């Protein structure tokens, strides 16, 4: 380990050995100097204009970490495509991780003239959280992930969180961390970082579409030996009075027919069109949202449950926020036009789970009598009933991979709801922080902490190793599926390639549903 | 005890990559028409801001106060109780799904 | 075409890049690439080392080959050498033909 020589190679590739699928990928990182070295109290109270929904109490830290839960942090495009069309599905089951190839520099600022140097003596800090102990501040859909394109040299995030609070105040419980409390590994150029990890088990994503659906399971040619209510009154003419007629359900009854289970959950959110001339002229955007209720502040139930985007022709409607939501490149931080952004579609689960922008069902509203006709009630919130099957939400290459299942007595289908996989034992939290190196201090003793501090920042390289397991196809469908597949004719540039500016790009988002499987 | 909370569990610092329906109308004047506007949650926006979780089931029970005053005046105890039908008969559900008992 | 050997699995291609070193960074976290770097190049050495197999001339014929050779008399210069100004050129295109085989 020294000065002249390189810590670590630079890999990147994909190997495909049968029932599994190698990824790795190296990027160049910087890290700068965060809060001036201190840790910072930050509030945000119902003063201003600023609502009770977003108040808030926590802290910023030095520190910076590492972040590569997307799957484009692993996966090229290509990769992916030869992912999901041909397996049914696949999950994480290792990886290796590593720091290396470190240089901290220094930044001398006089006379408007600005020089960097090296400063062969300096360090940066790492650690991982092995224990959870610190807020997982992963799994919240964060920039600052490695980036999609290997060429691409990025910034480290800064490290910050939040703890219980009133208003813009902290109560008894606020609990307070730093990140010097716990043991970290010092490394100076020509010293190295490294860890692996195994996943907990968990369940394959489901990379495919059913090509039968909940209410289309019989066989279409014979009747059900079962009976239902088919008649409640006469037909013969004006006579008509009350009675009781039974048939048997058919396969022009379909609807009628007994059958053995039910959607999935249900929780409505509005519906809105892309051709804006169809939509109400008021901004409803968070008075229509749907939201959930938690200790006095709301928030968007977003994306919410997984529910089918829209029904049978109507790709033209989406839930208000009840879908992922990509931005095209450079598209504006606030107000970005539609067709600056990508939504996403969960179509494909229409055929298990409720449209999101429809009623659960119907179900009977008092008890009919001869004198008082029958009432029915529309049921747009429903919640787990015995006999519902459903789909959880699809994952995309540029969307998050996982998400710490949260330290609860309880829970329900922990499938985090921005789609992916829920972990209770998730990647470790990997911190990163240059060590603060004093500028010359005074000459006589003072009590005071140093705040006068050399101007430096770090850099190198990161890899990050992951082994997935697959589950190949293994279908008996006769005619071809539907495959993902790049454009065929001219164009202006290459879908998910670089800009004659050298600006890399993803077109579009790039789901995982392509095979299709029976129910 | 939490020591964070389901709403709170974001990076108080950075942007998320994912945007959410910020607005629904134009805002220069009075000839505001239908539009779509989107945005990145971040911090000033936690409220907004795509999560990965939800709060545990609910069952509203009647809220009362220890401040006699500040309650109706008549008996409610029973007729306002939160209650669950079983063949027939009614049973308080008490003290039923776990909630927490008020706000701050 | 333009001469040579043609090979299924020629000599590699040997690609080579200087990793590029970001200048300092904002002290405020952005997502933007960075597009800062420090200016900077590299130089070294680089060696190639072939083996060639030669296949040896067994001619039977009597009189003298067609030969390459250095011209004889006096020049301002040396033929593949360098200038007064050191720089080496190379006066004409060398062939490869000059000893004969029968068909
Ligand atoms: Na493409
Ligand atoms: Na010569």
């Known amino acids: 380990d020294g000065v002249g020589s390189s810590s670590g190679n630079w890999h990147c590739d994909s190997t495909w050995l049968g029932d599994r699928v190698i990824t790795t990928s190296t990027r160049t990182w910087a890290l700068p100097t965060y809060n001036n070295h201190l840790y910072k109290q930050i509030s945000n109270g119902t003063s201003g204009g600023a609502t009770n929904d977003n108040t808030y109490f926590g802290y910023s830290t030095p520190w910076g970490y590492f972040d590569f839960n997307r799957f484009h942090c692993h996966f090229s495009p290509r990769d992916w495509q030869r992912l999901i069309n041909n397996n049914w599905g696949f999950r994480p089951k290792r990886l290796s991780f590593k720091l290396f190839n470190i240089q901290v520099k220094e930044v001398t600022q006089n006379e408007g003239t600005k020089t960097i140097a090296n400063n062969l003596t300096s360090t940066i800090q790492v650690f991982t959280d092995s224990e959870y102990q610190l807020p997982y501040?992963?799994?919240?859909?964060?920039?600052?992930?490695?980036?999609?394109?290997?060429?691409?040299?990025?910034?480290?995030?800064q490290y910050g969180y939040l703890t219980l609070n009133n208003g813009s105040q902290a109560v008894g419980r606020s609990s307070f961390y730093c990140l010097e409390y716990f043991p970290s590994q010092m490394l100076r150029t020509?010293?190295?970082?490294?860890?692996?990890?195994?996943?907990?088990?968990?369940?394959?994503?489901?990379?495919?579409?059913?090509?039968?659906?909940?209410?289309?399971?019989?066989?279409?040619?014979?009747?059900?030996?079962?009976?239902?209510?088919?008649?409640?009154?006469?037909?013969?003419?004006?006579?008509?009075?009350?009675?009781?007629?039974?048939?048997?359900?058919?396969?022009?009854?379909?609807?009628?027919?007994?059958?053995?289970?039910?959607?999935?959950?249900?929780?409505?959110?509005?519906r809105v069109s892309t051709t804006t001339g169809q939509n109400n002229n008021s901004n409803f955007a968070w008075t229509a949202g749907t939201k959930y209720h938690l200790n006095g502040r709301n928030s968007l139930a977003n994306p919410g449950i997984a529910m089918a985007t829209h029904k049978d022709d109507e790709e033209r409607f989406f839930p208000?926020?009840?879908?992922?939501?990509?931005?095209?490149?450079?598209?504006?931080?606030?107000?970005?036009?539609?067709?600056?952004?990508?939504?996403?579609?969960?179509?494909?689960?229409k055929t298990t789970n409720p449209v999101a922008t429809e009623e659960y069902g119907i179900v009977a509203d008092?008890?009919?009598?001869?004198n008082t006709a029958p009432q029915i009630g529309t049921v747009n919130s429903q919640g787990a009933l015995p006999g519902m099957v459903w789909q959880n939400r699809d994952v995309y290459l540029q969307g998050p991979i996982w998400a710490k299942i949260p330290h609860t007595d309880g829970n329900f289908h922990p499938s985090p709801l921005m789609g992916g996989f829920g972990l209770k034992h998730p990647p470790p939290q990997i911190l990163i922080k240059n060590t603060p190196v004093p500028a010359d201090p005074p000459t006589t003793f003072n009590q005071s902490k140093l705040n006068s501090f050399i101007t430096q920042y770090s850099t190198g390289q990161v890899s990050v190793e992951i082994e997935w397991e697959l589950q190949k196809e293994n279908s008996k469908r006769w005619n071809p599926e539907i495959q993902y597949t790049s454009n065929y004719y001219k164009s202006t540039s290459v879908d998910f390639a670089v800009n004659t500016e050298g600006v890399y790009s993803e077109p579009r988002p790039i789901g995982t549903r392509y095979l299709t499987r029976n129910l």
């Open 137 to 157: 501040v992963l799994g919240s859909a964060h920039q600052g992930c490695l980036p999609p394109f290997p060429a691409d040299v990025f910034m480290i995030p």
């Open 190 to 270: 020509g010293n190295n970082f490294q860890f692996t990890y195994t996943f907990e088990d968990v369940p394959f994503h489901s990379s495919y579409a059913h090509s039968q659906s909940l209410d289309r399971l019989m066989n279409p040619l014979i009747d059900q030996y079962l009976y239902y209510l088919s008649r409640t009154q006469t037909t013969g003419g004006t006579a008509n009075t009350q009675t009781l007629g039974f048939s048997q359900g058919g396969p022009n009854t379909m609807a009628n027919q007994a059958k053995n289970w039910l959607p999935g959950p249900c929780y409505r959110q509005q």
């Open 320 to 349: 208000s926020n009840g879908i992922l939501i990509f931005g095209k490149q450079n598209a504006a931080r606030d107000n970005a036009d539609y067709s600056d952004v990508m939504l996403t579609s969960e179509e494909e689960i």
């Open 366 to 370: 008092n008890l009919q009598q001869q």
